[PDB]
Write a protein that binds this DNA or RNA. Sequence first.
DNA 1: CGCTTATGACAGCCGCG
DNA 2: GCGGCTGTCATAAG
Length: 903
Amino acid sequence: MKEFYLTVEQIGDSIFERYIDSNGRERTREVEYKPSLFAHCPESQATKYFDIYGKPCTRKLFANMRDASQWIKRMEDIGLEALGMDDFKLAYLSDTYNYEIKYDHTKIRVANFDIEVTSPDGFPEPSQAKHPIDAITHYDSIDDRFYVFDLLNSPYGNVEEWSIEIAAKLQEQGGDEVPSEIIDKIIYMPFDNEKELLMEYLNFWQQKTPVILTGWNVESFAIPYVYNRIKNIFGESTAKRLSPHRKTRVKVIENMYGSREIITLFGISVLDYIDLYKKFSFTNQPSYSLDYISEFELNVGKLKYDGPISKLRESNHQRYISYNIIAVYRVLQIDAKRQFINLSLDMGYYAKIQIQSVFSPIKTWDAIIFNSLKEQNKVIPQGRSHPVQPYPGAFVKEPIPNRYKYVMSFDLTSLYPSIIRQVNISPETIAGTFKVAPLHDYINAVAERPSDVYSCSPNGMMYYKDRDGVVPTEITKVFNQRKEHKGYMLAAQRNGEIIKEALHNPNLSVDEPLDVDYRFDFSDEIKEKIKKLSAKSLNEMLFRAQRTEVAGMTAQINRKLLINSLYGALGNVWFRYYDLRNATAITTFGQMALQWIERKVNEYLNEVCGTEGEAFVLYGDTDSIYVSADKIIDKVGESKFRDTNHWVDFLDKFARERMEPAIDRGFREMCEYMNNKQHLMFMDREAIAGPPLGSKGIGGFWTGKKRYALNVWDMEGTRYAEPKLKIMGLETQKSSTPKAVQKALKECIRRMLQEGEESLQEYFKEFEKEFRQLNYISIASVSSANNIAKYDVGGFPGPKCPFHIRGILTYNRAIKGNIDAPQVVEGEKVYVLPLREGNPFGDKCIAWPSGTEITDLIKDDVLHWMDYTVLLEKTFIKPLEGFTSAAKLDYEKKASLFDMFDF
DNA sequence: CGCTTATGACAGCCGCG
DNA sequence: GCGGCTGTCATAAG
Ligand SMILES: O=[N+]([O-])c1ccc2c(ccn2[C@H]2C[C@H](O)[C@@H](COP(=O)(O)OP(=O)(O)OP(=O)(O)O)O2)c1
Ligand SMILES: [Mg+2]
């Protein structure tokens, strides 16, 4: 196999690398790296090296990296450009591995761990680490074993060993329900003193040193605490044994209240799963506790225990240890579904960066671009400093608030990257400028053609057509990858819908799930072989089909992020290729393209229809058009379709067979007009929306910008057995809405779109008749706790103090004194509830840490003073009234004046 | 060491016989 | 003591 790296670091004058060798063994190196930077030199000098603008450079070899950095600052102390790759880690990798990296994951040691700390006086701060570590579970990627480190004796009590035979039993038999799949993979190790325990962990750590270190919340807790606990007991020197090269950096990002520690272990790449999730899940959550994410992702109930967590070790040591084991396991199960560690590995090696740099789009692209240039012997510019400056972005159409019965939508495929490609926008391909007309002229085809020789954006920039730019080229690679994985995702989605209507009646039979790849459309044979399978066999395939969709979704949506992030970096001041002439060339172009095709669509439909001046496009956001399909149905008359599924097929045909050909013509005209390299504006048909036939439902509605709802029958080719609701921007999609109100409002919209006026009023009445009965958590709002300190003012609301922050302050007053009570942490999410006049807390609202239940200290008082009437009014009634007004419905029953002749 | 556009819940202030 | 507006903040749609 080819050689590949693990972790690279720079410690002084040397580079420390871990890597896999010729055969597959892990090694280490200390390379006194001699780097090469560049300087501009006279044209008269013959050379091999040129920068991106063509101007000639001379290479400078350095004795060491320390002299190399000295030279750079000396070059700016004088005012001359210091060219080349200033991050020597990246250059060193580029030198050593001057080829495309293939890697074997079975060789990479990925470690998942979690620790436990008993603490009778509140949450144990990693800074101090004053309380003892009584348990650690440590999963090893290569051994495939769960290493358990128990502690039997502690100043907070002494306990007998943990039983593997009891942990395996169901919780209904008084066991723990540690899953069977791992019962044979646990390695148990009891310890009689903490020193003995921690001492063993490090020797263990030494023989099995993690390359990739993951786990739940390990950056903020586990790592700092095992580092600091060891520090307090064995001294700072012994702690450094956590780092393969014995170097660690400590970062005290101390809050306005308490301390906060971030340790950096050199030679290890830490990827906290909480961070991976936040970056790659594309889901804003009300809580980020492991129990919450597990329930959400896996449908597995919480790890139940009696009494306070602090005394769980004392009360029930068996459960304690078992729950530590399961906690590590859940992260593994989530990852098995989300593929975030795999995703991180692909990107990190593709760009030749430190794996933990996957979180930075600026770094990832800087490297990709850097390497791409290096192979053509090109020299990269110096990273200048720039002042932060707002610049114009996309165009969003102002829609007339209303209902819309039949709607059809179209969306441009990676609009911003395609603009980059079409127009050939790159730092070194800048040709010149032209004098700009008002954008409407360009939209209306009125303005004079900008150039007949270069590639033009309506912001006044010109580009060469003759060559290829690094940006357009490198962006096309990741885009093609994204296009691939989107095809599988859409396939398994289409596949799933075939399995989903196939359990409208499964055969009573005993068989086995078919052996197929869900990444592809089922062939006519297997399509026919499906409905011949059983419920138990279909529920298995359905689940697998969705597993592959989930995994394909991950792969696609994140490649889409990275390519949109290249445009983003162009508009970021720390990016080497920061250039607002390029950033605005993109957005201005998009503003034009969207409005151009709006005009053009309104034309082809006026003609095809017969009428004149009709606005068919009701809405648009950035690169999307929403088309009023009503008048196109009128031509065929309302009643001429046997069932719902007929007007969907018809419209899908009218779109693909008629509209898209018209669109494709409309854009190449724009292409000619802007004289671009290659026509790359393709509109993919998205949604088909409307009510069921013979139903009083309304189909869809808009309330404003970014806020609308639609009843969708086909999304991007995928035909649904059951119609799904496309809901955007409304409260049902916000993580700040209470969970019960999310569901209730989703039901109101479904009854509005699919069934009609009457159906709505029925659900409204019953819900508010039952609202008082719901679990308080399910009807609490959610907000994030930012800048608590700013409005603190002795524990009372200061000037301009936000509502949720107010709730936080009133919470802190009530719990003051009792140090065991859960503290509210800066930056984290909180539950918020309104309070009734003259309550014991002496303020109008309370807030506590989210994902949790409130402490028995105040729990009953607050539950007892909850303001159900305000809660229902603001979280539920106002939003509904919002939807209703736009839909022009009632949800109630107004002054009938029929009231008199009732009965 | 590292994107803009937009809505809504609130605070605060202002006019209002 | 309520609506209109501006600004801060949380959070969505791209
Ligand atoms: O820096 N960012 O993080 C960033 C920058 C720009 C971004 C986005 C998210 C969207 N855009 C811009 C650039 C996109 O091309 C355009 C429209 O987005 P979209 O949701 O329609 O998806 P596309 O990127 O067009 O691709 P798709 O339509 O095939 O999904 O809106 C994110
Ligand atoms: Mg798009």
